């Protein structure tokens, strides 16, 4: 192997604490705006998200803010509350080890350009040789172009790359479809459907999968 590619959300960090902080503010603003209760605003907001799953737009918080004409920008929430982005303890030792060993490191994410800001705010950005978001290729995983553009920029072949992520449909199916090795990270005891090449609970497990040999 010559390169390891990473998903962001649920893989190297989680934005769930930020979500828990801003969702009540969304429900408040939605309630004010539409003349409905906060509980009904919650229903409408979450319903719209559910209705958009498996689509391009599902991946962008700003899409949902804009859809309801709310006075919120996800970039501003990120800048204001960066401590609500939680980096998993297994992330930095693994990136350090991979970088030192000579592996090229990439990001492949279906989220929009603010995904790069998330990496900067969590001190993760500089580990990666290339970072590709939905907004860079106008596509989402598992579309082949988002994977292929990333490895093109890294200068490696698909068979020389490993993809690591927490989505069976985006990450595992997407990576395998273009000839990469696919690792599924399963932090919460979910069902794997017998798909990925490897299934791990933390990124520390990549050491025993890849071996210690320098690239
Ligand atoms: Mg993910």
Tokens of 158: 């698909």
C-alpha–C-alpha distance, residues 181 and 172, integer Å: 9
The distance between the two most distant Cα atoms of the chain, rounded to a whole number of Å, is: 62
Q: Please report the beta strands in the chain, taking only residues with DSSP state E, as ranges in sequence order.
A: 3-6, 13-14, 86-87, 104-108, 130-132, 161-165, 181-185, 198-200
Going from the Cα of 214 to the center of ligand 1, the distance in angstroms, rounded, reads 28
3-state helix, strand, coil in the chain (%, to 5): 50, 15, 35
User: What resolution in Å is listed for this PDB structure?
Assistant: 1.7
Torsion of CA 42, 45, 46, 51, to 10 degrees: 150
Q: Kindly provide the b/e burial profile for residues 119-148, where b requires at least 16 CB atoms within 10 angstroms of the residue's own CB.
A: bebbebeebbebbbbbebbebbbbbeebbe
Q: What angle do CA 31, 51, 46 make, to 5 degrees?
A: 30
Phi, psi torsion values for 11, nearest 5 degrees: -105, -55
Confirm or deny that 136 is annotated as ligand binding: no
Going from the Cα of 166 to the center of ligand 1, the distance in angstroms, rounded, reads 5
Rg (CA), the chain: 18
Confirm or deny that 9 is annotated as ligand binding: yes
Q: What angle do CA 174, 175, 176 make, to 5 degrees?
A: 95
C-alpha–C-alpha distance, residues 180 and 157, integer Å: 9
Going from the Cα of 167 to the center of ligand 1, the distance in angstroms, rounded, reads 5
SS3 132: strand
Give the list of residues 6+ apart from residue 199 with CB closer than 8 angstroms, or none.
183, 184, 185, 186, 192
**CA dihedral (176, 198, 185, 211) positive or negative:** negative
Confirm or deny that 166 is annotated as ligand binding: yes
């Amino acid at each position: 192997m010559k390169a390891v590619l990473f998903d962001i959300d649920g893989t190297i960090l989680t934005e769930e604490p930020l979500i828990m902080l801003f969702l009540p503010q969304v429900y408040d603003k939605l309630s004010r705006k539409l003349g409905i209760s906060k509980d009904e605003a919650r229903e409408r907001f979450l319903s719209e998200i559910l209705g958009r799953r498996d689509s391009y737009d599902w991946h962008d918080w700003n899409f949902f803010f804009k859809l309801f004409d709310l006075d919120l920008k996800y970039e501003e929430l990120l800048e204001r509350y960066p401590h609500k982005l939680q980096v998993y303890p297994d992330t930095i030792p693994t990136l350090e080890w991979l970088r030192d060993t000579g592996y090229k490191l990439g990001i492949v994410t279906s989220g929009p350009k603010y995904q790069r800001l998330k990496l900067k705010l969590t001190g993760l950005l500089d580990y990666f040789d290339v970072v590709i978001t939905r907004d860079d290729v106008n596509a989402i995983k598992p579309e082949p172009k988002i994977f292929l553009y990333t490895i093109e920029r890294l200068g490696v072949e698909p068979g020389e790359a490993v993809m690591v992520g927490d989505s069976l449909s985006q990450d595992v199916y997407g990576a395998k479809s273009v000839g990469m090795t696919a690792v599924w990270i399963n932090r919460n005891g979910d069902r794997g459907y017998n798909m990925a090449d490897y299934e791990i609970r933390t990124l520390y497990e990549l050491r025993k999968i890849l071996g210690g040999e320098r690239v």
